[PDB]
């Protein structure tokens, strides 16, 4: 029947093709990797990152490549994302898959249908093509490959997020007003509230509201979810599962194990919101009916809070960037604010590749 | 091609001017060769043994290997007799060298390699020359 050798072969070949594609990409615009890698650096500390000079000059060896706009970088990153998905799949199936009389036997049946007048140049060409730059238009209109021809970022990012530049928190300011049952809270004071979650202890010991309040816990859930999805949305290239598991293990091994310690009050517990003299009473409190109840009711919330914490930490640069944006827009006039909005809009509804872009304008060094 | 023309002419003129010339006759080692299916000539030219090249090492065409060209005797400083070709071999400091080729054609092969295009100087040089730069031995056949 089907000779597995051929199948495994085609698999290794396709894997090669994909690696070559995302490598060509990483070649034309090194930022694609650089960007990614930098973020990775602050999640998995061990990661080795390139020389700063390379990053800045946007070069990999000698040639400094043209700087690309954000929308395109992100696009290609999501494309490479699906590529890596394909690759992972093929690698999987492959792992699950890995005489003379028969030679003439098959060579005889190969004589079948001799009159098959047709040119066959479509195995490596249809694949190579299936994964290359500009595979959609007639010649050069759309950077997206035929593989991901229906990939659209605007269905993943809103206009106010600007493909990861900012995160839209106005909505959450609304919900928040609804939560505090007043209006004493401004967008900026709300952001001031969010800042608490950059600290390892503030969001825990100086809470905006009582952490056992319903409205509050619900809000926090929604917000947390948003921040996380935004995080992975803005950094396709990093292994999502890796990050998730890292955080989960940090949660189990440290956070819920008296990770918060004070020289005065001892050990704080996220679930019971109480301190403890020594580690001894702390341990014999983790079996008590109280802590069982709480850890059994408020588990999801505590975990979500924690995620909001660490994901907001990983996004400190975006948080700051947005807060800045807020203050700017706020200090605008009417005409100014209008023109700025115009700009965000144009950036939002613009082709990721312009008919007037450069290809092969490399400088040296 | 205009700018490239002026520029090229320039570089060639300058380079033609600063050409060092000690006019020292090197030592050639001609030898009748044969392979298959005809007969070809092979020359073994030896160069200095780090004797005088110790004073000039400023990457000025130092990377450039010796060059060969086939010249017709129709043009000479004396213009007396003529009618045969010479396989001239040249290197910046050392003096030029020639080898008379009465036979109309020898070793003039037919697509030896598989048509790869790095013209270097010409089909002749890439096709049939070797420059042992580590030992300073130029072979030509």
């Amino acid at each position: 029947e089907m000779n597995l050798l051929e199948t495994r072969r085609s698999l290794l070949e396709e894997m090669e093709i994909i690696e070559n594609a995302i490598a060509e990409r990483i070649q034309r615009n090194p930022e694609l990797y650089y960007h990614y890698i930098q973020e990775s650096s602050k999640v998995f500390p061990d990661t080795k990152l390139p020389r700063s000079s390379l990053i800045a000059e946007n070069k990999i060896y000698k040639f400094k490549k043209v700087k690309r706009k954000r929308k395109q970088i992100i696009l290609q990153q999501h494309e490479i994302n699906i590529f890596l998905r394909d690759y992972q799949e093929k690698q999987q199936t492959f792992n699950k898959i890995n005489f003379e009389r028969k030679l003439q036997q098959l060579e005889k049946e190969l004589k079948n249908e001799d009159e098959n007048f047709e040119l066959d140049i479509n195995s490596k060409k249809d694949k190579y093509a299936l994964f290359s730059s500009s595979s959609d238009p007639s010649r050069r209109t759309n950077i997206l490959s035929d593989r991901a021809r229906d990939l659209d970022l605007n269905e993943i990012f809103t206009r106010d997020e600007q493909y990861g530049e900012y995160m839209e928190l106005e909505q959450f300011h609304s919900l928040w007003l609804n939560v505090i049952k007043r209006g004493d809270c401004s967008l900026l004071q709300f952001l001031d509230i969010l800042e608490l979650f950059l600290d390892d202890e503030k969001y825990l010991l100086t809470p905006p509201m009582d952490r056992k309040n319903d409205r509050y816990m619900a809000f926090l859930l929604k917000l947390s979810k948003y921040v996380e999805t935004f995080f992975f949305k803005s950094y396709a290239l990093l292994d999502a599962a890796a990050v998730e598991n890292l955080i989960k293990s940090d949660f189990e091994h440290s956070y819920c194990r008296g990770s918060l310690r004070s020289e005065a009050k001892g050990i704080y517990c996220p679930f019971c919101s109480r301190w403890f003299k020594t580690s001894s009473v702390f341990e014999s409190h983790l079996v008590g009916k109280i802590h069982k109840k709480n850890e059994s009711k408020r588990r999801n919330f505590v975990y979500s809070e924690y995620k909001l914490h660490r994901y907001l930490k990983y996004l400190n640069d975006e948080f700051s960037r947005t807060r800045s944006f807020v203050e700017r827009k706020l200090a605008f006039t009417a005409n100014e604010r209008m023109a700025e909005m115009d700009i965000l809009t144009q950036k939002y509804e613009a082709p990721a590749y312009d008919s007037t872009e450069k290809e092969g304008a490399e400088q040296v060094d | 091609x205009x700018x490239x023309x002026x520029x090229x002419x320039x570089x060639x003129x300058x380079x033609x001017x600063x050409x060092x010339x000690x006019x020292x006759x090197x030592x050639x080692x001609x030898x009748x060769x044969x392979x298959x299916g005809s007969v070809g000539m092979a020359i073994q030219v030896n160069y200095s043994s780090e004797v005088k090249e110790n004073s000039v090492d400023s990457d000025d065409k130092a990377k450039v290997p010796p060059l060969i060209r086939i010249v017709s005797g129709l043009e000479l400083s004396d213009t007396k007799q003529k009618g045969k070709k010479f396989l001239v071999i040249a290197y910046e400091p050392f003096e030029n060298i020639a080898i008379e080729l009465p036979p109309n054609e020898i070793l003039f092969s037919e697509n030896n390699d598989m048509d790869n295009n790095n013209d270097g100087v010409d089909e002749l040089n890439k096709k049939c020359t070797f420059w042992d730069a580590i030992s300073k031995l130029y072979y030509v056949q």
Partner: protein, 127 residues
Amino acid sequence: SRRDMEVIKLTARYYAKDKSIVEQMISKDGEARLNFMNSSHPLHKTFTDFVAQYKRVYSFTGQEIKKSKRTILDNCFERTQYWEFEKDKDREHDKLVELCKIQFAAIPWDKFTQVAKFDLEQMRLRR
């Protein structure tokens, strides 16, 4: 071309395991079908590819590939780097060639001083 492809890949499949079944087939049948076995027939080259590839599949049979996302990325970056390097070598070469053309064009081919009158590929290497 499906026929040619299929026979190349099949004789390549068998040729990848024994190399003796084809050398026997050639003498047994006597068909102008396997004319690609000789390095003369152009397609032969691509053949040398396929076999190699199959030979490769025989390499890690019984071994799984456990490359992670991080790693795959790092790898593609390093490949990129390589390509850039190679590109640079090509550039340098072009430059040197240019120099040569200049000097060749710029020396006196009339400064004659003759004396007398009248395989290198494996030689242009090192061993």
